[PDB]
Amino acid sequence: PEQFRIRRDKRARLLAEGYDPYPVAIERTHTLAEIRATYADLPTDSATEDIVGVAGRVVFARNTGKLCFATLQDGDGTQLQAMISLDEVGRESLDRWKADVDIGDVVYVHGTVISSRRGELSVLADSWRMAAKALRPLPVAHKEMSEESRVRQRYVDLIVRPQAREVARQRIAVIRAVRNALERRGFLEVETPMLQTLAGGAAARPFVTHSNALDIDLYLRIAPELFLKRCIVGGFDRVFELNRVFRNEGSDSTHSPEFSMLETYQTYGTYDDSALITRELIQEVADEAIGTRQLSMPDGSVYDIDGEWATMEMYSSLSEALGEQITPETTVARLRDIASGLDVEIDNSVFGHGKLVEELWEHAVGNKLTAPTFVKDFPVETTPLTRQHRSIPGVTEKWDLYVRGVELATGYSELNDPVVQRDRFADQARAAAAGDDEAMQLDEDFLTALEYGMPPCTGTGMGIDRLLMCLTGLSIRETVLFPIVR
Instruction: Give the range of 75-83, 136-144, 153-161, 458-466 binding ligand LYS by CB under 6 A.
Output: 458-466
Residue 163 near residue 186 (C-beta atoms within 8 A)? no
Out of 56, 366, 459, 483, which residue is the one contacting ligand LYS (CB under 6 A)?
A: 459
Is position 400 annotated in a ligand binding site? yes
Segment near ligand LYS (CB under 6 A); pick from 102-110, 357-365, 431-439, 454-462: 454-462
Contact criterion met (CB below 8 Å) for 239 and 445:
no
Is residue 175 within 8 A of residue 290, CB to CB? The reply is no
CB of 471 vs ligand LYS, minimal distance in Å: 20
Q: In this complex, which beta carbon is closest to ligand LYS, that of residue 122 or of residue 416?
A: 416
Residue (388 or 410) nearer to ligand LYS, CB = 410
d(CA 376, CA 273): 13
Q: Cβ distance 377 to 328 under 8 Å?
A: no
CB 460 to ligand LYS: min, Å = 6
* Closer residue to ligand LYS, CB minimum distance, 170 or 410: 410
Site string for ligand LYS, 270-309 (x = CB under 6 A): ----------------------------------------
Query: What is the residue type of 354?
Result: G
Q: Which is nearer to ligand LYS, 315 or 399 (CB)?
A: 399
Paired strand residues for 52: 111
Residue closer to ligand LYS by CB (options 358, 414) is: 414
Number of residues assigned to the chain: 486
Cβ of residue 170: shortest distance to ligand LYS, in angstroms? 24
Cβ closest to ligand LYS, residue 246 vs residue 412: 412
User: Pick from 310, 333, 318, 280: which is nearest to 395 by CA?
Assistant: 318
Among the listed residues 56, 104, 111, 201, the single contact to ligand LYS using CB under 6 A? 201
CB of 129 to ligand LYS, least distance (A): 53
Q: Which stretch binds ligand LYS (CB under 6 A): 19-27, 186-194, 457-465, 471-479?
A: 457-465
* Closer Cβ to ligand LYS, 121 or 375, answer by number: 375
Q: 394-409: buried (b, 16+ CB within 10 Å) or exposed (e) per residue?
A: bbbbbbbbbbbeebbb
Distance CA 360, CA 314 (A): 10
Half-sphere exposure of 270 (CA within 13 A, CB side): 9
The reply on whether position 461 binds ligand LYS by CB under 6 A is yes
407 marked as binding residue? yes
CA distance 80 to 188: 44
Residue 83 vs 204, nearer CB to ligand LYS = 204
Restricted to residues 389-448, the positions that interact with ligand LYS (CB under 6 A) are: 410, 412, 414
Q: With contacts defined by CB under 6 A, how many residues of the chain interact with ligand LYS? A: 11
In the bound complex, which residue of the shown chain has the CB atom lying closest to ligand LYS? 461
Decide if residue 124 touches ligand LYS (CB under 6 A).
Answer: no
Nearest distance, CB of residue 202 and ligand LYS, angstroms: 4
For the bound state, the minimum distance from the C-beta of residue 412 to ligand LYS, rounded and expressed in Å, comes to 4
Does position 105 interact with ligand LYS (CB under 6 A)? The reply is no
Residue closer to ligand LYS (CB basis): 284 or 407? 407
Residue 200 beta carbon to ligand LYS: minimum distance, rounded to whole angstroms: 9
Q: How far is the CB of 284 from ligand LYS (least distance, A)?
A: 20
Q: Which of residues 210-269 bind ligand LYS (CB under 6 A)?
A: 223, 225, 263
- Kindly indicate which of the ranges 54-62, 72-80, 286-294, 459-467 contains the residues binding ligand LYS, using the contact rule CB under 6 A: 459-467
CA-to-CA dists, residue 56 to 82, 110, 135, 210, angstroms: 10, 12, 16, 46
| Among 130, 202, 338, 408, contact with ligand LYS (rule: CB under 6 A) | 202
296-329 in b/e form (b: 16+ CB < 10 A) is eeeeeeebebeeebeebbbbebbbeebeeebeee
Whether the Cβ atoms of residue 227 and residue 193 lie closer than 8 Å to each other: yes
CB of 378 to ligand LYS, least distance (A): 12
Taking the complex as a whole, how short is the minimal distance between the CB of residue 432 and ligand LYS, in angstroms? 18
**463 near ligand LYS (CB under 6 A):** no
Shortest spacing between CB 430 and ligand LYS, in angstroms: 21
Q: End-to-end CA distance of the chain, in Å? A: 23
User: CA dist 134 to 62, 158, 170, 460, Å?
Assistant: 18, 16, 28, 47
6 closest CA partner among 126, 133, 145, 116: 133
- Binding residues for Mg(2+), by number, are 400, 407
- Binding residues, by number, are 400, 407
Q: Footprint of ligand LYS on this chain (CB under 6 A)?
A: 201-202, 223, 225, 263, 410, 412, 414, 459-461
